[PDB]
Write a protein that binds this ligand. Structure first.
Ligand SMILES: *[C@@H]1O[C@H](CO)[C@@H](O[C@@H]2O[C@H](CO)[C@@H](O)[C@H](O)[C@H]2NC(C)=O)[C@H](O)[C@H]1NC(C)=O
Length: 361
């Protein structure tokens, strides 16, 4: 079983206990740690935060304590215009330039693979994504000829049917990628006003339309399209989405005037780290959708949909019953890495959970 874990570059700038460096990672915790978001300059992979070279090294040293640990560098991301990706992938000329540039950069900095986070390709991009993947993987194999371990190639994929149908050639890329991470937590629409859970596990025997929005269908659908079950990886959020209620209505479908207030350390609207969410719970009424098997809290005019040890454990089990490769946890910096916020003196509670289940069989 695989437990891919993401670490983001910008989680170093948070204040106080919110500050997180590669340093803070249990090297034995995960099996794959993805440093989050390299970049592209002059059609070539490049750094992002000034000290990346340093964090790179801090993170890559963990392998000194656990030799079987593997690390990957991810390209793209949210703050990386998808148009930019699209532009690099259409001109075979600029695409090659990029590909050929990766191995060295990786080899140089100690990574064991690259991770494509081209965040949502267009209907006009499917054809080139495939190209990018097919060619990149090719470059990688050729490089292995040099007598060294072959680099890993993976990709962060959307779990939205339409999204998937629009720009992904699953049956294709499935054969070139080492593993596919399903973004199974961006389900609730950032477009419409209404309380809703972003990472439901199940369809929810109560709401007709949009049965395509839940982990269960995502996985099932991917499998239909051809993705081998042994290459799939279910994404598990370690954060929660906050909403500013617009009425005393707290139950399903209640009004929403906007994104909840920021977090003391997270400082961003609609997003809360698990550890922040831990503090929040105090004096908050905890609810849990039986049908979707996920929890949400409400305090004052604040409504929060999130995941806990038990919601997370479920998915972990699901993940295993369909026999998938393993799990993907978004941001170890969002989990209680210090472990001093959520009661129990445990560090990385949520991730542990996912691990514990994956390890008892
Ligand atoms: C990552 O690389 C991109 C692309 O080169 C950088 O983007 C540009 O930066 C310059 C100067 O700020 C602008 O004139 C260009 O219009 C930008 N191009 C693109 C594609 O955005 C970006 O600055 C780099 N990131 C960091 C953190 O250095």
């Amino acid at each position: 079983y695989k437990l891919i874990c993401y670490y983001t570059s910008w989680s170093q700038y948070r204040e106080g206990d919110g500050s997180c460096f590669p340093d803070a990672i249990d090297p034995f915790l995960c099996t794959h740690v993805i440093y989050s978001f390299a970049n592209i300059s002059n059609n070539e992979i490049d750094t992002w935060e000034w000290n990346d070279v340093t964090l790179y090294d801090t993170l890559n040293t963990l392998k000194n304590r656990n030799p079987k640990l593997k690390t990957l560098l991810s390209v793209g991301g949210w703050n990386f215009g998808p148009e930019r990706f699209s532009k690099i992938a259409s001109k075979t000329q600029s695409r090659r330039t990029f590909i050929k540039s990766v191995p060295p950069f990786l080899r140089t900095h100690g990574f064991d693979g690259l991770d494509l986070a081209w965040l949502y390709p267009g209907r006009r991009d499917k054809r080139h994504l495939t190209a990018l993947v097919k060619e990149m993987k090719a470059e990688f194999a050729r490089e292995a000829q040099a007598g060294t371990e072959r680099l890993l190639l993976s990709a962060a994929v959307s779990a939205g049917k339409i999204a998937i149908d629009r720009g992904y050639d699953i049956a294709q890329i499935s054969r070139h990628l080492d593993f596919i991470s399903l973004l199974t937590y961006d389900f609730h629409g950032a477009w419409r006003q209404t309380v809703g859970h972003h990472s439901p596990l199940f369809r929810g025997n109560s709401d007709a339309s949009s049965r395509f929005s839940n982990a269960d269908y995502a996985v099932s659908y991917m499998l239909r399209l051809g993705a081998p079950a042994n290459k799939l990886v279910m994404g598990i959020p370690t954060f929660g989405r906050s909403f500013t209620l617009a009425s005393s209505k707290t139950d399903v479908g209640a009004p929403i005037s906007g994104p909840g207030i920021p977090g003391r350390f997270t400082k961003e609207k609609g997003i809360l780290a698990y550890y922040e969410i831990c503090d929040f719970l105090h004096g908050a009424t905890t609810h849990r959708f039986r049908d979707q098997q996920v929890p949400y809290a409400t305090k004052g005019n604040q409504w929060v949909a999130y995941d806990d040890q038990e919601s997370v454990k479920n998915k972990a089990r699901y993940l295993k019953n369909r026999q998938l490769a393993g799990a993907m946890v978004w941001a170890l910096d969002l989990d209680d890495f210090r472990g001093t916020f959520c009661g129990q003196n445990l560090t990385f509670p949520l991730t542990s959970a996912v691990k514990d289940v994956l390890a008892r069989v």
